[PDB]
Amino acid sequence: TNVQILHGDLSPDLCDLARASELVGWDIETSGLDWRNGQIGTCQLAIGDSVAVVVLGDDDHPQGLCDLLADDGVRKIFHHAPFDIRFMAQQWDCKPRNLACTKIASKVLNPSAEHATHSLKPLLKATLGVDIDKGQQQSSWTTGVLTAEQMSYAVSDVVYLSELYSQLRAQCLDKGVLQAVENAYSFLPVWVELQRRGIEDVFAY
Amino acid sequence: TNVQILHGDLSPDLCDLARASELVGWDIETSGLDWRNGQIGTCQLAIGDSVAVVVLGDDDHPQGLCDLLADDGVRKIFHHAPFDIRFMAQQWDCKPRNLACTKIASKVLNPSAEHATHSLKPLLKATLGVDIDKGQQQSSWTTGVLTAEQMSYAVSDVVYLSELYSQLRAQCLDKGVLQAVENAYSFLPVWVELQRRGIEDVFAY
């Protein structure tokens, strides 16, 4: 894994590589859970054998990252895409396209499992035998400065997503639920627009 | 409008006509809002120029209606499909396919409107200039007996759905949101399976 640290936006070279990539792993770190009035601190992208950690500041509107997020020709893989894409769509006024989610896949595969088993850490252990440390999850991500410990945590949160997705995708195919999962993925851009306009669940009364 | 009253299941002639129809309007009446342990009292279907009201009894498992609901080659139009398909999927152990919803279309078109405007009665008035009377909505639908007033209400709840859908579909095309609406429709079979297995919102944490 080739780790790069950036600020303000993704580099043009990595934007180009992302457009040619099969899959782009994506995660964010934030001020908290407040997608409306909070702040994105980092974007971490896994592009090929590279992981890029982009440190963001107050009122950053990264054009390269938003163009990538909005590009329907680039497949983005998240763990719990709803959280990340809602934060980015609202904070950047960005329309995300071509989105996939390992947590949604886990839930469609095993809907009656205990809720905790769908979290990234247990899911990585159960699916790939990979152990990650979530200790820095609740650190302060929005100061424009990263510690080495934060960098390690940020890389670990994104670097396994493409492999996790590929394994979960295979499990969905084996069970005959991949089309169902893909129908959930195709609704994600609609879901987040509804969120921004105040419809919290279009399927509720 | 040619109205027919049936019991137990849809007639074979109407099942055949439904398979050749562009659209099939569908509504149900029930014991209440309890889709898990309640009871379906009627199914009302709009097939061509016909409306069929099928009166159902305790523990009815209508094979013809479930086959139609599960047939991906038959386009069903509901108003608030989530309510109806969840009731039918749970009560009949049926897998619904190829579903559309005038309420979801209304919400994607006008997500910031007052919630009441998405109800069938105001939506029919605003879109088609049609007035319906909802007085019999909260009657007792599960006794195996229908009054003439209940029959009139049941017909009115389904007979305008194909026209309402066509008008809303045109509005979605004009605004450029039809693909978004169709992505919501394609998630409905996944949504209801998740509901039955206890995932109330796969997009929540």
Residue numbers in the entry:
A (entry chain A), B (entry chain A): 2 to 206
Quote the passages of the study that discuss this structure, keeping the authors' original sentences:
Dinucleases of the DEDD superfamily, such as oligoribonuclease, Rexo2 and nanoRNase C, catalyze the essential final step of RNA degradation, the conversion of di- to mononucleotides. The active sites of these enzymes are optimized for substrates that are two nucleotides long, and do not discriminate between RNA and DNA. The active sites invariably consist of (i) a catalytic DEDDh/y-containing core for divalent cation coordination and catalysis, (ii) a leucine residue that wedges between the two bases of the substrates and (iii) a 5′-phosphate cap that coordinates the 5′ phosphate of the dinucleotides. Here, we identified a novel DEDD subfamily, members of which function as dedicated deoxydinucleases (diDNases) that specifically hydrolyze single-stranded DNA dinucleotides in a sequence-independent manner.
To understand the molecular basis for the specificity of dimeric NrnC homologs toward DNA substrates, we determined a set of crystal structures of diDNases: (i) a complex of diDNaseNoc with dpGG to 1.55 Å and (ii) diDNase from Rhodococcus (diDNaseRho) in its apo state (1.72 Å resolution) and in complex with dpGG (2 Å resolution). In both structures, the 5′ phosphate of dpGG forms a set of salt bridges and hydrogen bonds with the side chains of conserved residues K104, H80 and Y206, the latter of which is contributed by the second protomer, and the main-chain nitrogen of L121 (per diDNaseNoc residue numbering). The side chain of Y206 also forms a π–π stacking interaction with the 5′ base of dpGG. In diDNaseNoc-dpGG, the side chain of the conserved residue Ser120 engages in another hydrogen bond with the 5′ phosphate, whereas in diDNaseRho-dpGG, it points away from the phosphate. Additionally, L34 splays the two bases of the substrate apart in the same manner as leucine wedges in dinucleases NrnC and Orn. In the diDNaseNoc-dpGG structure, the C-terminus of protomer B is pushed deeper into the active site of protomer A than that observed in the NrnCBh-pGG structure, creating relatively less space for the 5′ end of the substrate. In NrnCBh-pGG, the side chain of residue H205 forms a moderately strong hydrogen bond with a distance of 2.9 Å with the ether oxygen of the 5′ ribose, while in diDNaseNoc-dpGG the side chain of Y206 repulses the ether oxygen of 5′ deoxyribose, pushing the entire nucleotide away. Coordination of the ether oxygen in diDNaseNoc-dpGG is restored by the side chain of residue H81, which donates a hydrogen from the other side of the substrate. The third discriminatory feature is the apparent restricted movement of the side chain of F84 in diDNaseNoc, which engages in a perpendicular T-shaped stacking with the benzene ring of F88. However, mutating F88 to an isoleucine residue alone or in combination with H81F/Y206H in diDNaseNoc resulted in significant loss of DNase activity without an increase in activity on diribonucleotides.
